[PDB]
Design a protein around this ligand. Structure first.
Ligand SMILES: [Ca+2]
Lengths: 7, 133, 132
């Protein structure tokens, strides 16, 4: 959700 | 429990509740990631960590030293760098929580250094006493 | 004469904290969404709602009856259905929050009916008082 998991 | 460990853990809990948890927008760090909301998270992150987990660890006297406490605090940031990326807003918040922790420890340095010493000495002392009986 | 309003708001606040906030791992529903962390949320959602907001509303006596309270509770689920989709696990948690609220209101239904009537009667005696 949103910016989570972007890395 | 033992007086010096009770005292050391009392100070660590004040740093978590008084300072780290008061960082603005820090709430997503206050509890473990929900595996149902973020199914990926537990696949990727080998050592999950959060401020509730640290408080339970404090309450169980896991931490005999500032270094063991910081290992868990630093993991919160490392996990966000890895999962969310190093420039992500989640990671900026995590860095703020790490920074207030180190700043606040520096403030209780004298006492914490002594308590750490006192707990180490007592352990070796109990093993020495058991040897002598 | 706001005794009945105070008592009604006290019950709603305890439903929120003891029942709705106690749904497991429901933390994300306890705070408003901040656009810094979910930058697209407010492309989709018009009227955000969360359980800390509902607690603030109750402290200010926003709700004089169940209907206005339930509009806000149900908005939490409607927003998750729209943003996350109906079968998302976020939605499944929002539906547990709504269901434990309805269940609890139904337990206290006759007492809440009575407080709702007495809130309206106090207001009326005051309007009649004021009107003349
Ligand atoms: Ca469904």
């Amino acid at each position: 959700k949103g910016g989570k998991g972007l890395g | 429990d033992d007086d010096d460990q009770v005292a050391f853990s009392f100070i660590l809990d004040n740093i978590v509740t008084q300072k780290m948890m008061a960082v603005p927008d820090s709430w997503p760090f206050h509890h473990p990631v929900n595996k149902k909301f973020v199914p990926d998270y537990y696949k990727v992150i080998v050592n999950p960590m959060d401020l509730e987990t640290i408080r339970k660890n404090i309450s169980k006297h896991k931490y005999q030293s500032r270094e063991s406490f910081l290992d868990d605090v630093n993991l919160i940031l490392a996990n966000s760098v890895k999962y969310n990326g190093p420039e992500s807003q989640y990671t900026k918040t995590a860095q703020e929580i790490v920074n207030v922790c180190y700043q606040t420890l520096t403030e209780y340095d004298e006492h914490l250094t002594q308590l750490e010493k006192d707990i180490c000495t007592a352990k070796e002392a109990a093993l020495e006493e058991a040897e002598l009986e």
